[PDB]
Swiss-Prot record, chain D:
Phosphorylated reversibly during heat shock. Can be UMPylated on a tyrosine residue by SelO/YdiU, probably under stress conditions. Belongs to the chaperonin (HSP60) family. Together with its co-chaperonin GroES, plays an essential role in assisting protein folding. The GroEL-GroES system forms a nano-cage that allows encapsulation of the non-native substrate proteins and provides a physical environment optimized to promote and accelerate protein folding, probably by preventing aggregation and by entropically destabilizing folding intermediates. Forms a cylinder of 14 subunits composed of two heptameric rings stacked back-to-back. Interacts with the co-chaperonin GroES. Can form asymmetrical complexes, composed of one GroEL and one GroES, and symmetrical complexes, formed between one GroEL and two GroES oligomers. The asymmetrical complex is the functional unit. It was suggested that the symmetric heterooligomer may represent a transient intermediate in the chaperonin protein folding cycle. The modification N6-acetyllysine is found at K28. The modification N6-succinyllysine is found at K28. It comes from the Bacteria. The chain holds residues 90 to 177 of 548 of the full protein. This is Chaperonin GroEL. Each subunit is composed of an apical domain that binds non-folded proteins and GroES, an intermediate domain and an equatorial domain that binds ATP and is involved in inter-ring interactions. Forms a large central channel that appears to traverse the entire length of the cylinder with no obstruction. The central channel of GroEL functions as two cavities, one in each ring, that are separated from each other by the crystallographically disordered 23-amino-acid C-terminal segments of the seven subunits. The entry and exit of polypeptide seem to be restricted to the apical end of each ring. It comes from Escherichia coli (strain K12). It is found in: Cytoplasm.
């Protein structure tokens, strides 16, 4: 592997060229009145979308190094969506702005480490301004209000989201299911959600979601890392005759067993998926058991002397639904007996009695919440299947926004909040002159999302930015209606958390690029 | 896969070039005296046709992006035909006209978003003028009149179309079968049509039609998604022994079973086709049953406890004919007994009495119509197979025109209707100056189909258009006879619905391209 | 699948260039003294022939578009031969003549649509003149006279042809068989000929003929489309054991069974062929049965409940000979008992009494003729096999000429008739000036076959044409003898039908090219 | 500019006739004969221009419809007379 290596400006300029291509294409779709982009499939007609996230995913550059820059931004921007649910397009816009002006500063002979430090300082100061700016969203009115707005003026969608949170609680678990009929159903049923992803991207049966949905699947509980194919066979065949999907929970699965299942699921005999068990060490023992009680399943432990081959359907637990995304696994309506599950809760509540550690009482309390809290599930009813799934997508988008809105409140969505904060900290300075430059770059970059939106609309960015600066608080310009006033009242807003994370991620990658003196890649 | 990205003028110019190639070729065949096009097949001699749709299917460009523009137009133009039945070429002609003048306008420095908005207003305004212009077709005389015209001046074809509608109804189900003999037969037999397409395009045994015809096939009714090949094997083998085709209805079929059935059907031992069940969720449960009663078959449900493997011929319903197109499935002359079918209808009629809600009452009423209304069929008789088969194609073409004529009436078909409407709203203005320009582009573009018709004929486009402008209503020039008068009375007309659909689709794609800043494709 | 597309002159010029090479090479062999062409074989030495058909068949061009022009002419020219038996070369000559001037006319700026119309009018008028010019062939002396002249001045060939027609009838079925002995045998035996060709070109065991000859084959009669390999297996081996060819008559055969049979016959275990059954719908029910009675076989009907697997040799009819060409199938000397066949005729004669409709009477009558009339056959005898096979080819060529001569009479064959007709209607004019030009183009083109004949000979085309123009009726120049007089009396003539068919086909393709504005082909 | 246009139309149509298998020299004679007759027609059609406004109108039309030009020119010709010399 012969390496091509670039240093300083040759390296950084190449990244700049790469990032600009990615950002220039994606940014046009940011505003309510965005400009559509055309992507092309290998066999068939071209594809047009105003979705920045779809455009960004597809982008790759021939020139190594330039490609690297785009990928670096895509990685961080994708993360903002992962931790916020929106702002992926906004993060990229901000990243471009911070990077371009800051990058020029290093090329001008100014010190890069200080510029990063200055930018970070501006970012840290900026985040507090958003927090002061931020309007809380804790009550029923705000929960429904943000949910309906996100849902594109659909009051009913917001109403169920509020009801769900109201019932299970803000931190509770809410899931979305296809509607059995026209009426919308909100129900609380035994179930559990935990942090853990799928072992392979190949397992996914729902490409747009990036998640795996299974119908009334059997559930396998295991106490060891799976190092071999052979253990699965007697149970694997048994589920195959049943004609239903199989779900596996264990410490880890090795490639010899994992790879065959991946190949087996993809154009194969039985389509199954497996995930890692929640917790570690001593905790997984209790954690796995809670799931067993919930699904009415049997736990299999190597330590006990029980092996996977020695297992049957009776050992396996069941649930009506299970959905697995990139890092989260959740189950709906386990078949475990109510007496068993309620009884299990009593045992855990009793356990909480020692209160030996803040950690142990907290940890036990969390287990209670996962097992006894239950899972709130919403069915979406509609006149037609197309409307039903489409509405369902809208509900899920609103739900992510509602959770982000709840956690940190909300800010004006027209990119107004960045504008408002940028004008607010004109005063902040750094010890080194180079640091001051980093600060200006960061604040100047903040303005860009507003201008981009206005630019997309075909309106003058400078005129609108100037007027917005004049006004204060949540006051701003609504690009969609061509009006000025309180953006939140209008319905144009973004969760505080998403604006914060987009901005922070943009700064993290920008500083990271600024301090890079070398790039290594394979030759063309 | 490194991406080549085009944006701004570079992106738009390539789309323009791509659309012009597609439109220039296809437009020549639009007129009654349209010029022919030569397509060269990879095997044997070249093929000459005056059919624009055939030419459109063949058009692909070497230059990526430019190719995309053509494909984008083809997709939308095909859709107009799909929702209408004719005017695929007309839509393409209009698309070219709107795109070229509007695209020049964006290049000039005008705002694209406003131009789209202006065009949309003009398009929307044009549709009401078209509605007023339109001559209604509700009477037997009108039904026959449009039917015979479409059928290339064959009165007998028109007479049957009117008779069919007169029995089952305007919204009823009409099907065409090869004639058993010389005499034309119109019959009403038990049968059902529903809006569900075929999972695999490979299933089609009739390449010109794009539909699947089966003779006295067995019918499988299932209540689950099919993910495994093996369930099908005992029933599958049983039908093969029979020596005749098998039809499958269920939630959906996965690639594991679908791919093998597709391969099994093409150059394989048993050739069968499958479609999705009508309705959704709770609703499908009753509808699948309706089909079962109609064909004398047995419904199979997972919930009940019966599996596909545990099934036999006695469990399968039968019909003399079934035909499946790209998005519709219909069955003819099911073997279900009259006592069962009529009784089933009574059960549904009884259900209607509850009247809890309009949605459920109506929904039940729709079920009654499908199950009890019956399916009218047409057999076409001739002394020679060539005449018989050719006549059948003509009947079907006339039928689509008659349905479109019925639903929205008819308009002069010489391109005259676009001319008449364009002249009528010469005072329409937008807000922004750019919006006004979009309006002029849209109305000006309307003229092109007339001019194209006359141009193909080798006659003066401007002089004929000038005289046509002078006249009022349905007055215009008949390209076929080189005469002026009422176009509808001359036997030249298009359904109101096809003219509208062509115009609307052309505007949708044109505006869509105008608003697109960036295009993405793979490198050469 | 990128496409290269040409419009107007760029498209038309390529067709012109393509047609000219096809026509320039083929035209040299048209005269009795025609020049020879050298075709190179992939294996072995080069081949020289004066046969225009072999030359034309072989020609293909590198330049896409130019190739299309040649192929377009070849298809059309081949069709003239298909519907006339001769004039394949003459059609191409006429096509070149009309195409070259017509293309210049469009190039000159005159309207193509009108030019086509003018040419067609000239064609229609010229055909009418040809009909008046033509000397009818009705009586035995004319029948024998044309047969002997076609047969290269052999009286015996002519004598048998006249006798055959005089026996079974002008419209009856006459076949040619290898002579069992030295003497010529003309016999009338039970047999049937119907319109229907072979399903696969691969089946042909006689490549010069393009027909399939089978000796005393077993005959399978079936009433369903055959889509499966399996039904033939029990019957197929039984014929293999026999060591004789098998013939199949049914609705159709699908690629599943057809493709395997094609491979099986070609370089495989059993060599057999299958054709489509005559008639359609209930008509075929009667048509298949007549054949069964004729061969002593048993018809197998799905509706009866009988299956191909359930069939044996006893259910198969037999005939001493069967020959299948591109669209004609005939059987000779079927086994079927005379009492059965003759009795079957009695049932049909009885059926005629119903007289429900003119169509039914005629259709029943046709069945009588096919069965009761019998098939007249000719055994060609000679001392040596080389003389015998050669003589047989000559008989077949004479037979086609005799059928054409019978249907429309005969005309001078030196291309004199085109000369005579072209001079006769110098009067004809069109409403549009462009049409008048088209008329001259068509008339002028007519002269070329005469000139080509003289040109090939080595004599002045203009001097001979000039003298011929001066004369009247069938008077003209005989290229073979270099003399002037009545061409028909001199032994040189063409059937009226071949002259007409060549001329009309040339006109059809020429006009078709003239109105073409676009050509599509794959890149080099 | 007007003369050039006539050459354009005559030539294109004339060549087209030549293409149509016609002797060009005869076509030239036809053209020349038609032209001679056309010239005679113009002499009969011509209306005398003697008043100042008519002179102004030709000046205005010649000067790409500039009214001021026609106005100023008419004044000059009237003043200097028939044989007067006017320059710019
Ligand atoms: N407003 C007008 N309307 C109609 N014809 C006009 C108008 N103005 C000028 N013309 C005519 O067109 C001709 C060409 O104008 P011009 O540019 O002066 O060409 P020349 O340079 O005269 O070929 C004039 O001689 C006149 O007959
Ligand atoms: Mg001038």
């Amino acid at each position: 592997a012969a390496k091509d290596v670039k240093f300083g400006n040759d390296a950084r300029v190449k990244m700049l060229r790469g990032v600009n291509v990615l950002a220039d294409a994606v940014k046009v779709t940011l505003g309510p009145k965005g400009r559509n982009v055309v992507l092309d499939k290998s066999f068939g007609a071209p594809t047009i979308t105003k979705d920045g996230v779809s455009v960004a995913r597809e982008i790759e550059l021939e020139d190594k190094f330039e490609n690297m820059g785009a990928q670096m931004v895509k990685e961080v921007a994708s993360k903002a969506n992962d931790a916020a649910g929106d702002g992926t397009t906004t993060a990229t816009v901000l990243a471009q702005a911070i990077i371009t002006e800051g990058l020029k500063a290093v090329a001008a002979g100014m010190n890069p480490m200080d510029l990063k430090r200055g930018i970070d300082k501006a970012v840290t100061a900026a985040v507090e301004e958003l927090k002061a700016l931020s309007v809380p969203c804790s009550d029923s009115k705000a929960i429904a209000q943000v949910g309906t707005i996100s849902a594109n003026s659909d009051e009913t969608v917001g109403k169920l989201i509020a009801e769900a949170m109201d019932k299970v609680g803000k931190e509770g678990v809410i899931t979305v299911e296809d509607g059995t009929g026209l009426q919308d159903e909100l129900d609380v049923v035994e179930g559990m959600q935990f942090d853990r992803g799928y072992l392979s991207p190949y397992f996914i049966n729902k490409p747009e979601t990036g998640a795996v949905e299974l119908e009334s699947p059997f559930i396998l509980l295991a106490d060891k890392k799976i190092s071999n194919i052979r253990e699965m066979l007697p149970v694997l065949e048994a589920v195959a005759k049943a004609g239903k999907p199989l779900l596996i929970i264990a410490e880890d699965v090795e490639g010899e067993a994992l790879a065959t299942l991946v190949v087996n699921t993809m154009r194969g005999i039985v389509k199954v998926a497996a995930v890692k068990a929640p917790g570690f060490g001593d905790r997984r023992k209790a954690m796995l058991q809670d799931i067993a009680t919930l699904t009415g399943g049997t736990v299999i432990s190597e330590e006990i002397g029980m092996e996977l081959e020695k297992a049957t359907l009776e050992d396996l637990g069941q649930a009506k639904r299970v959905v697995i995304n990139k890092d989260t696994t959740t189950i709906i309506d386990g078949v475990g007996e109510e007496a068993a599950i309620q009884g299990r809760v009593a045992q855990i509540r009793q356990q909480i009695e020692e209160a030996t550690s803040d950690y142990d009482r907290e940890k036990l309390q969390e287990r209670v919440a996962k097992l006894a809290g239950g899972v709130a599930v919403i069915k979406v009813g509609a006149a037609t299947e197309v409307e039903m799934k489409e509405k369902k997508a809208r509900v899920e988008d609103a739900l992510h926004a509602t959770r982000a809105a709840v956690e940190e409140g909300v800010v004006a969505g027209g990119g107004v909040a960045l504008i408002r904060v940028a004008s607010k900290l004109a005063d902040l300075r750094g010890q080194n002159e180079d640091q001051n430059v980093g600060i200006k770059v960061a604040l100047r970059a903040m303005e860009a999302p507003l201008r981009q939106i206005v630019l997309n609309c075909g309106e003058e960015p400078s005129v609108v930015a100037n007027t917005v600066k004049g006004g204060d608080g949540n006051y701003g310009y609504n690009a969609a209606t061509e009006e000025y006033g309180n953006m939140i009242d209008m319905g144009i807003l973004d969760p505080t958390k998403v604006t914060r994370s987009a901005l922070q991620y943009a700064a993290s990658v920008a500083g990271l690029m600024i301090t890079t003196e070398c790039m290594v890649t394979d030759l063309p």
